[PDB]
Amino acid sequence: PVNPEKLLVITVATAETEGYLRFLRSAEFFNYTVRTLGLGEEWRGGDVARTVGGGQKVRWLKKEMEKYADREDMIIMFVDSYDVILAGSPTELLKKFVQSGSRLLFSAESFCWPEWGLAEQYPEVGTGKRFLNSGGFIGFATTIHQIVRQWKYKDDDSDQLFYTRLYLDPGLREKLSLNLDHKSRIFQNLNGALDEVVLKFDRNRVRIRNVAYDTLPIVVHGNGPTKLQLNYLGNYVPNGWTPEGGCGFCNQDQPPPRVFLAVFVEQPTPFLPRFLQRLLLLDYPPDRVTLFLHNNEVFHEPHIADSWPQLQDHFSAVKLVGPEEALSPGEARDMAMDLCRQDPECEFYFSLDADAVLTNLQTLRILIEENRKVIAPMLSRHGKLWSNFWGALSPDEYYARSEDYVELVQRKRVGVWNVPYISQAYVIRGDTLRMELPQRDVFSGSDTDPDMAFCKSFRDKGIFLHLSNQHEFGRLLATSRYDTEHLHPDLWQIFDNPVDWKEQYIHENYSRALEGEGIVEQPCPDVYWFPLLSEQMCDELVAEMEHYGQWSGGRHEDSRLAGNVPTVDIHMKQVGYEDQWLQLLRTYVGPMTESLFPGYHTKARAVMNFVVRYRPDEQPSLRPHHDSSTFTLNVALNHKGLDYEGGGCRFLRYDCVISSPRKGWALLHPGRLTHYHEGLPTTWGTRYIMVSFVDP
Amino acid sequence: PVNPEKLLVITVATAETEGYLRFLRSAEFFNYTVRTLGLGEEWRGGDVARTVGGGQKVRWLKKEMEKYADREDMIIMFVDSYDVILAGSPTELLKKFVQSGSRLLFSAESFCWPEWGLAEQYPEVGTGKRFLNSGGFIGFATTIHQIVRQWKYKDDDSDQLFYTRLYLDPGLREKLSLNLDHKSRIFQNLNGALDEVVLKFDRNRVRIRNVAYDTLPIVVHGNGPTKLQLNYLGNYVPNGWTPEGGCGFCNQDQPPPRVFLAVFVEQPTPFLPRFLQRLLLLDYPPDRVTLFLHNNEVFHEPHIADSWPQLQDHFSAVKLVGPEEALSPGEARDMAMDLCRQDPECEFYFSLDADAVLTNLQTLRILIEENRKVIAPMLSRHGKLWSNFWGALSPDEYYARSEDYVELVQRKRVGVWNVPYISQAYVIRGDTLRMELPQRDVFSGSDTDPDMAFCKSFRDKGIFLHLSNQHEFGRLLATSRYDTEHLHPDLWQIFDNPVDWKEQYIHENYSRALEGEGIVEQPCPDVYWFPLLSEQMCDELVAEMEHYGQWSGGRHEDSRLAGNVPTVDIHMKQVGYEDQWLQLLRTYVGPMTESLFPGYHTKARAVMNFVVRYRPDEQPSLRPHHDSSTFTLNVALNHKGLDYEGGGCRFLRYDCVISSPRKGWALLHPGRLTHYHEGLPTTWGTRYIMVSFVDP
Ligand SMILES: O=c1ccn([C@@H]2O[C@H](COP(=O)(O)OP(=O)(O)O[C@H]3O[C@H](CO)[C@@H](O)[C@H](O)[C@H]3O)[C@@H](O)[C@H]2O)c(=O)[nH]1
Ligand SMILES: O=c1ccn([C@@H]2O[C@H](COP(=O)(O)OP(=O)(O)O[C@H]3O[C@H](CO)[C@@H](O)[C@H](O)[C@H]3O)[C@@H](O)[C@H]2O)c(=O)[nH]1
Ligand SMILES: *[C@@H]1O[C@H](CO)[C@@H](O)[C@H](O)[C@H]1NC(C)=O
Ligand SMILES: *[C@@H]1O[C@H](CO)[C@@H](O)[C@H](O)[C@H]1NC(C)=O
Ligand SMILES: O=C(O)CCC(=O)C(=O)O
Ligand SMILES: O=C(O)CCC(=O)C(=O)O
Ligand SMILES: [Fe+2]
Ligand SMILES: [Fe+2]
Ligand SMILES: [Fe+2]
Ligand SMILES: [Fe+2]
Ligand SMILES: [Mn+2]
Ligand SMILES: [Mn+2]
Secondary structure: OOOHHHEEEEEEOOOOOHHHHHHHHHHHHOOOOEEEEOOOOOOOOOOOOOOOOEHHHHHHHHHHHHHHOOOOOOEEEEEOOOOEEEOOOHHHHHHHHHHHOOOEEEEEEOOOOOOHHHHHHOOOOOOOOOEEEEEEEEEEHHHHHHHHOOOOOOOOOEHHHHHHHHHOOHHHHHHOOEEEEOOOOOEEEOOOOHHHEEEEEOOOOEEEEEOOOOEOOOEEEOOOOOHHHHHHHHOOOOOOEEOOOEEOOOOOOOOOOOEEEEEEEOOOOOOHHHHHHHHOOOOOOHHHEEEEEEEOOHHHHHHHHHHHHHHHHHOOEEEEEOHHHOOOHHHHHHHHHHHHHOOOOOOEEEEEEOOEEEOOOOHHHHHHHOOOOEEEEOOEEOOOOOEOEEOEEOOOOOEEOOOOHHHHHOOOOOOEEEOOEEOOEEEEEHHHHHHOOOOOOOOOOOOOOHHHHHHHHHHOOOOOOEEEOOOOOEEEOOOOOOOOOOOOHHHHOOOOOHHHHHHHHEOOOHHHHHOOOOOOEEEEOOEEEEEOEOHHHHHHHHHHHHHHOOOOOOOOOOOEEOOOOOOOEEEHHHHOOHHHHHHHHHHHHHHHHHHHOOOOOOOOOEEEEEEEEEOOOOOOOEEEEEEOOOEEEEEEOOOEOOOEEEOOEEEHHHOEEEOOOOOOEEEEEEOOOOOOEEEOOEEEEOEEEEEEEEOO | OOOHHHEEEEEEOOOOOHHHHHHHHHHHHOOOOEEEEOOOOOOOOOOOOOOOOEHHHHHHHHHHHHHHOOOOOOEEEEEOOOOEEEOOOHHHHHHHHHHHOOOEEEEEEOOOOOOHHHHHHOOOOOOOOOEEEEEEEEEEHHHHHHHHOOOOOOOOOEHHHHHHHHHOOHHHHHHOOEEEEOOOOOEEEOOOOHHHEEEEEOOOOEEEEEOOOOEOOOEEEOOOOOHHHHHHHHOOOOOOEEOOOEEOOOOOOOOOOOEEEEEEEOOOOOOHHHHHHHHOOOOOOHHHEEEEEEEOOHHHHHHHHHHHHHHHHHOOEEEEEOHHHOOOHHHHHHHHHHHHHOOOOOOEEEEEEOOEEEOOOOHHHHHHHOOOOEEEEOOEEOOOOOEOEEOEEOOOOOEEOOOOHHHHHOOOOOOEEEOOEEOOEEEEEHHHHHHOOOOOOOOOOOOOOHHHHHHHHHHOOOOOOEEEOOOOOEEEOOOOOOOOOOOOHHHHOOOOOHHHHHHHHEOOOHHHHHOOOOOOEEEEOOEEEEEOEOHHHHHHHHHHHHHHOOOOOOOOOOOEEOOOOOOOEEEHHHHOOHHHHHHHHHHHHHHHHHHHOOOOOOOOOEEEEEEEEEOOOOOOOEEEEEEOOOEEEEEEOOOEOOOEEEOOEEEHHHOEEEOOOOOOEEEEEEOOOOOOEEEOOEEEEOEEEEEEEEOO
């Protein structure tokens, strides 16, 4: 049994990057003792993500090893730090090192590099990896000193080639007992072996298993183009997310910092007035928030103009960049982000897109408390898997589904996740914009999509893109085929955005009245009365009818039964709102009717759907008649007294009169046999009603 | 101006027949002074309806004229009496006689008889009648004596030939100034001139007009085969029936005579039990009535058997002649009539057929008060023109429509009418059967129809067949295609006899409840409750269902809506009663529904009509459901407590229960949306209901 007190882990890090801190946390989880070489210094090893190099690591190790030149009692493991996480304990590590029978065990990998021609010099191995990788090795301090002290090359020379050439010396390999971890018993390099690595879960920790060799590696090395795969594994291994503990680093539980809030409207997006009004409700001191709003659509200029006085009176400062600036989305996002970068008072930058609905008013706070450089709240299309983040990339950096993507979207696993792509909503530390991403062309510069260029700019600097589903934050609006050719296009959004359509157009008490609690009334026998449409729905529907303007006249025929009984009206089929109103009937009127008439079942068929107009100059009344319907829906659309004077509906066989109709409320009565009824004359103004003969 | 006191009318009559009395009344109406020759004597003039004769008239006239042989101051008119009516006053008569310039004016007619060869000897007349008729002449008493005193022939010789030969003497015609009433200014002979004679009406008298000559004759002579045409005219001329006075001889306003009442059932006839029960209700002392009933149908033997104890206990005496006697209708009617003839105690004979419905219970009295030899009450098919009498005959003695037939049937003209044919109901004086029609073969003897032989037997004896529409007497049942292949065939008589079908099967309060007066109830909201079917209708409908016996079982489907909801039942289409029940719905349920639900209009369409059976061993209940109907008719068919124990119908949304249904009563409720309802379990016995899903 080798004493873990004799094991020392040595790594190299020229800065306390997020990858290096992720490495330290994994090492501290297993009580490793780690010595970091070169924290204050400048990396002279060259662009290691582009070419070969890393010789500066050997120079610092060689210098460090001189004081351990005679320490046969010490075992030393050298690993990278930016793309390495530890998955096993020092006891299991030293046990496996002794089992190898080696005095200096390098990591093995599938590829022979930098020089391919050296592959013939390598010993033959059956099913295991054959070639050396210098990203991780472990051995006696004396044996390691005898290897690293031969370093005498440039900082930007290849350390992999240096260790490879020494290993391929047949005499030296035999003398010092050099070996390679062929079956990944200790070191797991990810490049060329992604299909061999899977997550092995435990109650309060997560490891990886090599299914090719049935091993549980100690060191996980995301060498080469496997940085994103290591980011994925790093969200779990070793204590990132556990089945019984949840996240292992997230929160899960004085003036606040000043924030630049940037709003982007880059396409015609539904319910923008609701979004602009929602900005006033975000739970963050508005005296600490500066508002930037770029609107690329002339369709939204009136929406922005109506809300701008309230916004300017609310926030510390406001600035609108309208469509007349001819700014591309990438130029506008570069401009807003740079306004925060070039302002030392901007402590955090909050970028919120117009299709992002923030149901959680505490979103800005929660993200700032997470204390990340870049963090995004998880927002999803309602009922769908589409969301504001990607779990994986294709090699061409297009979308790909990750193994745990559906678990994250469905919030089977909650926490703060390191993901390759975020969009639509993210909070970025101001210091990071100045110290690490100082360039202007973050979203622009290339023919790639501005959102992809943004994420790729931070990945190229090793900046993690975090995503939190720790709380419910909101949803994403559908903006795909938003038909703008309407006086009020949001009336037609019942299919694409039903949740927001209900909150805007369905009466705020429809739900409460549907569960009971004594809101629905029965003013006349078997004539029920419930709130259905909001006042905004009534005003926009009436306005949409008058904008059409072609009301009924003579010769018009309706499905009424008396003794022809027409009305001056506009059918939904004429204005193209039939499919929309039939959806309202199925979703909202159908279930209400079955609750008020127990035993009846409805699919809400209705061929007759129309808005009637009553006026003293036109048709002020509607003589007694029946309806070609099982039951009739009768919704008022304006106010009595304010908009019109005159009676409503009278049911003759009961001597009962609905004299004072309520605007958004709807009447529900049988249409045949029993409820012979008549519309009382409108004596002043104009009376609008919406009526459907459902189940004919 | 010739004094009417100098005018004497002379006629011949060997008996005071109805024709002779009709002649006297017309003569007394104009204050004629009439002397009748030969009242007590026997007619030796031969069969004058078959051959030639009448010479006995001249012998009696010649003898009578000898005392007026020198009376130049006297004008004398000789006419027949049996087939003659007077239409003008003696003043107009004498004025026209003087205008003729004749001393002896014979009647003229179209035919030259008995000898045709004498036509050449007659003077030529342009447009008027050319030949002599001895049925009527008028002239001076001296001139008439010089003609009739030359009589020296047999009693059965032709008087027409006697007067013809004297007129055709050119010297004698000139000497005595003999003439013929060519243009019918005084005498109107009907034979050969029926198309020339029309009725001319006044306020309180009726005449005839000869449209060929534009004359108003004084004497109407129904010579030859025109006796029935004179009977027709005799009902009006001169004071028979007038537009302002009505009938001129009918009534229009102590133990009663003993009556033999003969009932004839010669075909399967509907509602015979109702007829037999109606015999007990005729308003005539039953101790004075003897009942004879001939039944030719074995189908009616049970009907006769059920009523026979009550009939025998009611009348003075009863006698049934059943189908086992193998009697033809003519033999049975001969037998019953002869039973009265051969009984001196039979004062009147009342023959009533089974298809005669006597609504007027005072029919036997009213007819006896009319004091006629033979009189029939007018009975008609309901709403039709077919009735129990004929107004005219074809030459082959088949039916023909008379000029006033429709006026009589529609009772535009009411009175007592002399008609050529009666049937189905008539009262015959017993004395007439003994003294004038003593033969047995009244209805039998020839291949002619027994009803026609009956009427022809009385016409051959000069007996008038009278018909009274002075009152409403009743109607005639349709017996044409009476389908007897049913357990209760009268259930299917709703089309052919709707008036009697309603009185037997429709509840006795349906009408009263339909006019209001607070019979209909509303036990549950919009569930009405009215009496519809009588108890006999319910018992016969239930019995007809069980006689079919093939009730529903598994796999049966109904037009009910819940959450399949079947019932053990029998649809009307299965038993062939659909068309019948649909007629009940149109006539009786439709109008009731429109009265109880003002504004609704119904044609009573119903594809689902069925009788449900509830039993504890079978299907005792009917779970909650709706109906494929606008409204549902629910009629009980038996008694609760007596026939079954268990609840009825429960309407869930109202917490209202029809716990105690009434047998013949029907429920009327909506079938959709509001009246989710359930049939409570029948715990004992059997519960029958009739249900229609009307207006689906
Ligand atoms: O600015 C830097 C860059 C790198 N490192 C360190 O150098 C190591 C190597 O960088 P890495 O991102 O892990 O590159 P790799 O994808 O692992 O590929 C490597 O492959 C060889 C063997 O691992 C290395 O010597 C080369 O630096 C490099 O090309 C990092 O982990 C860090 O520990 C720094 O301390 N600072
Ligand atoms: O049993 C009788 C039959 C006849 N008459 C009288 O004779 C008259 C002639 O009888 P009728 O029925 O009128 O015969 P018609 O159809 O008029 O035809 C007649 O035509 C000749 C001229 O009128 C008559 O002499 C014949 O009797 C007769 O054939 C009657 O009106 C009676 O006045 C009797 O008094 N008793
Ligand atoms: C690490 O050491 C601390 C004491 O320094 C001890 O409490 C803890 O249990 C150790 N954890 C592991 C995983 O060895
Ligand atoms: C008939 O005579 C009576 C008196 O004898 C007279 O009252 C009546 O008016 C007369 N009628 C006619 C029609 O001449
Ligand atoms: O005017 C009303 O309130 C009734 C209108 C109605 O029922 C209809 O539109 O058919
Ligand atoms: O059993 C009852 O009273 C109800 C029966 C009924 O409504 C039906 O026949 O559908
Ligand atoms: Fe309309
Ligand atoms: Fe209506
Ligand atoms: Fe059925
Ligand atoms: Fe029912
Ligand atoms: Mn590395
Ligand atoms: Mn005659």
